[PDB]
């Protein structure tokens, strides 16, 4: 009635072409057939943001540092899930098909080799990041153990609207990636525990570990229980592996057990709804 | 340039007639002018829900056990603002104006002993509480030390859009006043610092603390740091006293420190403002 | 697929005479009825050693200060959990029937009133403890949602061999009610996780709390989930009380997950009789 | 009146072949060396399990990646802990002398370089390593500073009943050797403790720390005294040298200081005759 | 080789007349005589600052208030410890011998009833308290155990000089008794910790408990070994008794194994530190 | 209000000629800028202790592994401290003019390239290093924020009698780089605090980090604020940055918000007389 995870504190890639973009691919491939090998009963591995082609603010909007989703680069992640049946959820900034500024992108496949899950960065910065807000909503799919996936990127962690929307659309885990430096690693905690607990939902969250040369990232794989505890903690090591078992159904059942007012008191709803927030 | 508060773990009453109320209503006032004496920097103080009227569920919502807002009661807590020149937050279970099912609320008066502050609970705590959704929304007043106060109450401050609405109406510094039992003690650490972080904003937070023959309440009042941070945290004895500095102009500078996309990504955020969240 | 206790961190008693014990099995009885009603969901209530009789010291042995298991207190207890519809875990020095030293002993009564387990506490805290090595073993019986409780007694948890008993028996829950004082307070929170740990067992541990005028009994309610992480803990304020939902399915399909010759010598004069450090 | 101990968290070693052991060897052999010039009170010094031989789980068991123990390997470390006079714990994976499958096996030398106590991984796990249990039992011998030292391996420190024997047979340090992945992270620093509490004892644990391409090693040396507390704790860097003062003399006095003889557990008796079912 | 101590969270005593005192030294001695009967090794029971007198500020330096010491008070005390045969170490409110303002002062008795240390408080926790500056320096004794005992009084370990004056004077051990508010809980138990490890030295502290009407005591007695690790820490109710063996010569054995460069040594040396 | 801090937990130099010396320089520069363009807010970037010159204890007084300050080595940092315009702390084993044992010295050099401080460690441990003591007493200079800085060196943290120097003459932030070993992390975190909350001041602390084949250096990065909380705390891995925003103004706030001495130990050693 539970599946195990395994989340990957992946070391931040130092990339500065497509080829250091294609050595990224080989190790994520040979790190989910080792995880497999290591962890005979995971379903779920979890790569940070950035994992394949890094943080290189020179370069990452250019052709040569961005893919189609899908794309030989997501079929070589499916043939390696389908390779290993494991669910993989993965990053890849994405070639904006009108044209446009690029998309911050995260997939989930299948132990089929199926993408079940694509997902646009709803919250970029937007100083730092160059990312067009995600336009795909938060999409939600079936995964093992009788999960309802959702995956989220980074900054929208911090917003509790994004947990909110994924439980209201009928999550019960909600994946996090992100490529954070350790200047949030309390506030990433905290947010990892109380998207939990606000919405009876796990948490499974990981981040980007190692230096880069500007930043250093903090890693810190957690996963946290539907009532907001830490159950698992990784420390900031890249190539930790933060592994747990999760029970779904046990987040489904606190929610179904645990004519009232409907109208809206928050001021701030309906203007974030109407687009008119400020 | 900041103010200084007194979150006050009063120990839970047990009330059977009008009396016990006015014994409560007594004591609370003894407790402004006794931790202004011993703490003669104080600006802030703070008392937890039902700490005038208590929780005796067979009775709470008899007339006997009911207020009305203002009324004879916030006057004597009025008189006792004005002589020691504090901000008081109370709790009153208030009678409806209309004959309807009662409010739970809340109340700031300033040190002129005048009312800038009425809130009447928005998210009852279903089902053991029979009170009326507020009606008021949540309202903000200008504090000392340059501070923006809003209040919310218990339950209240386990739904994010509360402290979301509160900093979105220009509150620095949210207030929650409790009356939970040791059961949520760890959710109730946990929201109050997400609260704080999610919205760059203090929280000043506290609960009864003592046994009414029923429950327990863990006290444990709680002063949060606009980076979720805990700056203060008392344990689960009644009168413990937790007192802190707080700067609300710091809060204020972060929150200062193309265009942004305005289209709302949440169906969650559409519904709610539709009054059809479902 | 699980079930809802509350551990009650109740007030060690000031215990100078019998009245003294009927009152706190009147404030015990009271207590499951308001418990249950403000847990609704509530199917299990722990209750402190020495909580209906206390330890006053230069009288626990007297025959006033001593209960026959079953008697007319586990009676009262009984019809208290039968009325309010729960497993109850209640503590009771008991007289030793061929009058010799007194029994420490512990009882869980069922949601009709019966008594499916009696425990007599197999390690009494010497030299400061007058009461008999038990001599009923470890017993184990069945619980509410699915769990198989077993009941261990203060000194009791600090010995890996009674977590491991209690496992080895089939339980996969074991409570743990307790009078110690402030002084064990680290090794107490210590041992609760290892034996939940080692066993793929839930620990559900009580102690009295307050002051009776000799000792401060640190109260601290603890619940363990099988891998030996503490899902919920109180502090040391008398009337505390701690809740937790256990869920013993999954400490069963956790063990379902998984030489024959002994090489330990200690246990070899354990069990021969002849431990000898 | 005590003696200062360093715990490796040695990367976890990628070995392919004899020569990758032989880099193990000399690296342990640097280690030993530069750590008492480091530290020039150290008289003990604790390298984890797999430290000379890794996890290749493919050819483990080969003749190529198999020592006799003693052997030419051992006898480098005995040369190393003379040279820096020190005690030193050491992991061998250990040729069968009858044929069959090898063991498990832990070492300690003396700053003489004489090999004072030899064991062999009592609880090997077997689904995953392929070790025989041990067969040497869980032996004691004389340590530094009025210690009397016992070392048990990985899994071994999961049983309370291993740290029982060591204490029953007079051991007042027990040294644990690991090479676990991140997983146990916690139960690793639980279990270190009860088994230093329950046994009035201290412990010395070190894990391999690192990723060798499968799972990533937390290190975490822990050191806890007789109470149970964790004095000092190291992180999950490869290469964190945790070092400790203890204090035998502290744990004895303990013991000393601060019956029925029949056994009622049924798992004691059952085990003790080989019927543990 | 060490000693057993109990360091006793005293509910803090509203006081409104010297019978009100009477009642808190009837408490006292009783607290005397059970602890050591509980713990049967015990050999150092400690008393938070104003455990005896209270904290009633608008009657505190009356006459009817204050007591000499040694006086009636102490002897009884006295007494106590000699017929539990502990040491132990207890608050008086003292009345000025020249009629000036009162001091703050803490006793030592041994166990054969004798008055070993007394101390008056050097850095009295202005402005809300009117004692005066003590005038005895920070006198060390002969304690249980191989202990060398010295003690200091609540504001008196923030200051880091009163630690290392302990140690200077050759104290292993030091006692710290105070009666703050909880305002500075997590200052007290960062204190003990740093006056410890910068002197290798155990810190057995404990302040009052419970609420007086003012203020919430926190209590949480707190014993430290000479590395600064917290060996034992007690929560904020009234009655915890925090209990801990100490090894005095440990502590000895690790401090076993000229100009001045700071101003304000020099300014402070001589009186005119500003 | 106030100001932006980044301390390095810089790997521990392995250092056997002066060629990697200056391999250790240009690194330290590289990472001045490039953590200056990941924080454009950064202005303090504090460097641990040995950071340029290692602790190869068979070489570290021979001439080669010696520099003057200031000399062409704080040049480099200067120039780099004025190209990112941030304030920069160092640590330079310095040659001793006077031909006698050399000193362990620390500097802070500001936005303009100017040596605004200049402390030679007071207290260097006779046993294992071999540095004078230091002769300039503890200075104090204006920092960013309206920070006033002082600078201290690994064991000078221990003695409360250095955080206190530097709070009597006027620093409301004090700085501590360190080339510690494991042994005393948690004492380290102790200090740092209690420095901190008895002097009512900020105390900026950073150590080396990782294995040099003899320690293990925790790193361990610790901003504490002036009532003794540690805000921000590094782990153990080399390069970690730690980052804080720091607000001197409310440390003298705090501050603004019988004489003779009663210690025995402050005469003596005031008098030389300690012992």
Not at 85 to 95: A, D, N, P, Q, R
Not at 120 to 132: A, D, F, G, T, Y
Request: glycine share 10%.
């Amino acid at each position: 009635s539970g599946f195990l995870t395994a989340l990957i504190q992946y070391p931040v890639p130092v990339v500065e072409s497509r080829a250091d973009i294609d050595k990224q691919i080989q190790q994520i491939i040979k790190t989910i057939h080792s995880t497999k090998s290591g962890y005979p009963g995971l379903e779920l591995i979890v790569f940070p943001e950035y994992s394949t082609q890094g943080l290189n603010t020179k370069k990452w909007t250019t052709e040569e540092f961005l893919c189609t989703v899908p794309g030989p680069e997501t079929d070589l992640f499916a043939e390696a899930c389908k390779e290993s049946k494991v669910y993989g959820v993965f990053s890849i900034m994405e070639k904006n098909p009108d044209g446009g500024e690029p998309y911050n992108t995260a997939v989930i496949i299948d132990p089929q080799g199926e993408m079940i899950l694509k997902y646009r960065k709803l919250n970029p910065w937007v100083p730092v990041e160059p990312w067009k807000a995600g336009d795909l909503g938060l999409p939600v799919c079936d995964g093992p153990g009788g999960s309802k996936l959702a995956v989220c990127i980074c900054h929208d962690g911090m917003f509790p609207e994004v947990a909110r929307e994924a439980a209201y659309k009928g999550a019960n885990v909600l994946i996090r990636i992100s490529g954070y430096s350790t200047q949030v690693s309390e506030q990433w905690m905290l947010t990892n525990r109380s998207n939990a607990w606000q919405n009876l939902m796990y948490t499974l969250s990981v981040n980007l570990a190692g230096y880069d040369g500007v930043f250093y990232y903090f890693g810190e794989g957690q996963v946290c229980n539907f009532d907001g505890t830490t159950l698992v903690q990784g420390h900031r090591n890249p190539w930790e592996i933060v592994t747990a078992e999760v029970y779904p159904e046990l987040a489904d059942q606190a929610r179904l057990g645990w004519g009232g007012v409907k109208e809206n008191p928050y001021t701030f709803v309906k203007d974030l709804a109407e687009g008119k927030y400020k």
